Curated annotation (Swiss-Prot), chain B:
GO biological process: cytoplasmic translation; response to antibiotic; ribosomal large subunit assembly
Positions of post-translational N6-acetyllysine modification: 43
UniProt xrefs under Pfam families: Ribosomal_L6
PANTHER family referenced in this protein's UniProt entry, alphabetically: 60S/50S RIBOSOMAL PROTEIN L6/L9 (PTHR11655), LARGE RIBOSOMAL SUBUNIT PROTEIN UL6M (PTHR11655:SF14)
GO molecular function terms listed in the Swiss-Prot or TrEMBL record: large ribosomal subunit rRNA binding; structural constituent of ribosome
Superkingdom of origin: Bacteria
Name of the molecule in the record: Large ribosomal subunit protein uL6
Function of the protein: This protein binds directly to at least 2 domains of the 23S ribosomal RNA, thus is important in its secondary structure. It is located near the subunit interface in the base of the L7/L12 stalk, and near the tRNA binding site of the peptidyltransferase center.
From Swiss-Prot, chain C:
Recorded GO MF terms: large ribosomal subunit rRNA binding; mRNA 5'-UTR binding; mRNA binding; structural constituent of ribosome; zinc ion binding
Protein name per the record: Large ribosomal subunit protein uL13
UniProt cross-references to InterPro entries, sorted A to Z: Ribosomal_uL13, Ribosomal_uL13_bac-type, Ribosomal_uL13_CS, Ribosomal_uL13_sf
A Pfam short name: Ribosomal_L13
Domain of life from the UniProt record: Bacteria
Organism: Escherichia coli (strain K12)
Gene that encodes the chain: rplM
Keywords, sorted A to Z: Ribonucleoprotein, Ribosomal protein
Record's function text: This protein is one of the early assembly proteins of the 50S ribosomal subunit, although it is not seen to bind rRNA by itself. It is important during the early stages of 50S assembly.
Curated annotation (Swiss-Prot), chain D:
Gene name tied to this protein: rplC
GO biological process, one term: ribosomal large subunit assembly
PTM statement from Swiss-Prot or TrEMBL: Methylated by PrmB.
HAMAP family, per the entry: Ribosomal_uL3_B
Protein name (record): Large ribosomal subunit protein uL3
Organism of this sequence: Escherichia coli (strain K12)
Length: 38, 176, 142, 209
RNA sequence: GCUGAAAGCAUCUAAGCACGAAACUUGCCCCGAGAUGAGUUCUCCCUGACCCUUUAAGGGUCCUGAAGGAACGUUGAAGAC
RNA sequence: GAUGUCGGCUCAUCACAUCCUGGGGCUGAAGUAGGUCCCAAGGGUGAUGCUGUUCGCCAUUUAAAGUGGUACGCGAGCUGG
RNA sequence: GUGAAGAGGGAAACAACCCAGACCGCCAGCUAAGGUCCCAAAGUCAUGGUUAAGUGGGAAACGAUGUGGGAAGGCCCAGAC
């Protein structure tokens, strides 16, 4: 998990989701692409 | 919304009860029922049901699509149900069913026993396979997830409980 | 001539029973407070309690809007330096359901001995059974 | 589960055959007689009220005498209540004796600790003493500071200070039951229990175990 | 995490359903009805006359003195008092 | 027309930007042991040689020897280097 | 300009900010700034919208399929995504 003020799609398999008021990036190919905004 | 446009076809032998919001499905596999959101029209018709929003309900189309999907899963529930398959990978790993309980030997210092819920049954063809059957898709998925959580597939050899149709994607340490 | 003043020994107070199920907490508590203080009577006097007795039934069925059922927090301090304690609205409804109504109304009542005397006439119940049939409370719609 | 009321008889030792000395407290548990049974319908909770010992007939007042007469039991030196578990059931006037602890193996003992009177902070709260020498001026066992300064501007509630020590209700948990002696009305527990010799103790099966 | 649409797919979430920490509420110990919102249970005691006017949760006289308490004394592993 | 100062001692109390213990994500995470971030303030969190020292450096521990606020917390509480 | 050397009303409290300049009395009326659910005087007013965070009722670069309005382009029943 990366906790950042600026979360972005780092590759094409990455998807921006909003889970309970938190903008999160869930990638299905690279685990170190997981981000939550905070 | 548009997923909700497509009606769900009622096959033969399965019948529908509608009490406004709570809807019950009967079939050869058993009783499935739920209460839909307050913002979805459900209407039994000629061997089909159709879903649509109420009035004065924002995002009634999303709820309509959700209700359509749940009802369609119910229909495939009371007929031929759902099956989930698990595989145990790793030396010494084993499974066995004793009635309503699965006994898992997953490398712990203690036995692991899982109590199946009401409408789910299990059977192990071999000692490293588990097959689950049931009418409720959500419940069988929950049980499979609970079984997997005991020993999640680790990323260096793939050892642990995993779904049969699952890709584990291992990795090497540094080199050699 | 001097204006009329209510005399505490000649005020006539009635008994009413309200049913709190499904009512918004604050919008019910406001009407409760104005009838406990007596602002609905033409004999209203700010220094004498001319209000009515109110019985509140089904205190655990009171309703809040938005996300207040899990986000409204009730703070209080015990007097010790650790002190500060809190409970959400759900926790209060689960433990002492009467106190959410009681402290809403108490917050909307005047402060001082007269306000406490006014609050003394509120009777809040969790069920829908009260013990004051001998007072013959009339049904009040809020 | 219900307990019993006894009195602290004193302390001794029990030698075991393999050469171990167990320090025991000797508790005299005469039969406790049930004086009143409380129920949900009448009282709101389930409990039994018991009495033990004896009292001088000229020292027991008319209200207490009438309360004893209703149960049909002789006056005792006091009355105690024990809360009732779900399975338990007792009748007024029934005697409960020490073989209740026949196979318990751990007890909770409650008594009143010995009164130390007014106690200083060094004894009451294990405060450290200040210097005996090296310039100290009349401040050898005094508490020291008790607050900070303007910003709090007060002493906090619950501050550790000198005052009454002891002479209060104390419980000691999970004491080994060494010996249950039915015809002697004796209970032998391992270790020390609160109070002085001849004081009343409430003995209950251990809640933590 | 499960099921799942909005967005024919994906998605732990929007509807719904699971787990999840010495933190929180309890569970353990102690105080605690001046909780003036002053609670409950059990037991005990007292069921005599008259007078006045200012008439009322009025005063006064005679007889009566309970259950209990206090006081005093001998004291305590209780205690500055 | 007076708000006593550094350090020590005694006694603390709060914050969390967490030192330990607790939970978790990622790892250039095989294991052991780590790195980094997230949650978490319940409890705990050294004795000394030197120096007035705070600090610091050393010597031995410890699960750890936290960072700060409180008139650089505390002299109608002590000391007075 | 105000305070100083100016009270009254508002800004919770709040010389210096907003309204406004107290000769005395009245248990009369209309207004200012600010307000009108309760504390606490007066709209739980009317009509049309927006917001779902208790935003309103503290804070930037920057980040995001959170929604409501424009304004115009692509791609599409010869089949688009």
């Amino acid at each position: 998990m990366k906790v950042r003020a600026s979360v972005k799609k780092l590759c094409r398999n990455c998807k921006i989701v909003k889970r309970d008021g938190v903008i999160r990036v869930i990638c299905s190919a690279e685990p170190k692409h997981k981000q939550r905004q905070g | 919304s548009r997923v909700a446009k497509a009606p769900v076809v009622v096959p033969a032998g399965v019948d529908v009860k509608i009490n406004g919001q709570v809807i019950t499905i009967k079939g050869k596999n058993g009783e499935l029922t739920r209460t839909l959101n307050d913002a979805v029209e459900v209407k039994h018709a000629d061997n089909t049901l159709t879903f649509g929003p109420r009035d004065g309900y924002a995002d009634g189309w999303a709820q309509a699509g959700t209700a359509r999907a749940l009802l369609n899963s119910m229909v495939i529930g009371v007929t031929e149900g759902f099956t989930k398959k698990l595989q145990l990978v790793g030396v010494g790993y084993r499974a066995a069913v004793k009635g309503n309980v699965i006994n898992l030997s997953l490398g712990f210092s203690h036995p692991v026993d899982h109590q199946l819920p009401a409408g789910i049954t299990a059977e192990c063809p071999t000692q490293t396979e588990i097959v689950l059957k049931g009418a409720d898709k959500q419940v069988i998925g929950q049980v499979a997830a609970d079984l997997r959580a005991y020993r999640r597939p680790e990323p260096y050899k793939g050892k642990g409980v995993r779904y049969a149709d699952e890709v584990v994607r291992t990795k090497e340490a540094k080199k050699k | 001539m001097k204006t009329f003043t209510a005399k505490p020994e000649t005020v006539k107070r009635d008994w009413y029973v309200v049913d709190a199920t499904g009512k918004t907490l604050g919008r019910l508590a406001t009407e409760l407070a104005r009838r406990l203080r007596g602002k609905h009577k033409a004999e209203y006097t700010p220094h004498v309690d001319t209000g009515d007795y109110i019985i509140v039934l089904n205190a655990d069925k009171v309703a809040v809007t938005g996300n207040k059922r899990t986000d409204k927090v009730y703070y209080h301090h015990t007097g010790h330096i650790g002190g500060i304690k809190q409970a959400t609205f759900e926790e209060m409804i689960a433990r002492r359901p009467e106190r959410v109504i009681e402290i809403a109304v108490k917050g909307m009542l005047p402060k001082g001995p007269l306000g406490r005397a006014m609050f003394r006439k509120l009777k809040v119940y969790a069920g829908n059974e009260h013990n004051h049939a001998a007072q013959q409370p009339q049904v009040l719609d809020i | 589960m219900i307990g019993l009321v006894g009195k602290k008889v004193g302390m001794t030792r029990i030698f075991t055959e393999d050469g171990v000395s167990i320090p025991v407290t000797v508790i005299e548990v005469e039969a406790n007689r049930v004086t009143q049974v409380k129920d949900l319908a009448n009282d709101g909770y389930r409990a039994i009220q018991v009495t033990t010992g004896a009292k001088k007939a000229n020292r027991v007042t008319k209200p207490e005498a009438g309360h004893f007469a209703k149960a049909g039991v002789e006056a005792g030196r006091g009355l105690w209540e024990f809360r009732l578990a779900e399975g338990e059931e007792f009748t007024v006037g029934q005697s409960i004796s020490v073989e209740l602890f026949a196979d318990v193996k751990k007890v909770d003992v409650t008594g009143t600790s010995k009164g130390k009177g007014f106690a200083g902070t060094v004894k009451r709260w294990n405060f450290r003493t200040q210097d005996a020498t090296h310039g100290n001026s009349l401040s050898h066992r005094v508490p020291g500071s008790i607050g900070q300064n303007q910003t709090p501007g007060k002493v906090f509630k619950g501050k550790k200070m000198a005052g009454q020590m002891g002479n209060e209700r104390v419980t000691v948990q999970s004491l080994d039951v060494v010996r249950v002696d039915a015809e002697r009305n004796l209970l032998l527990v391992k270790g020390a229990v609160p109070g002085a010799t001849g004081s009343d103790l409430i003995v209950k099966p251990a809640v933590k175990a």
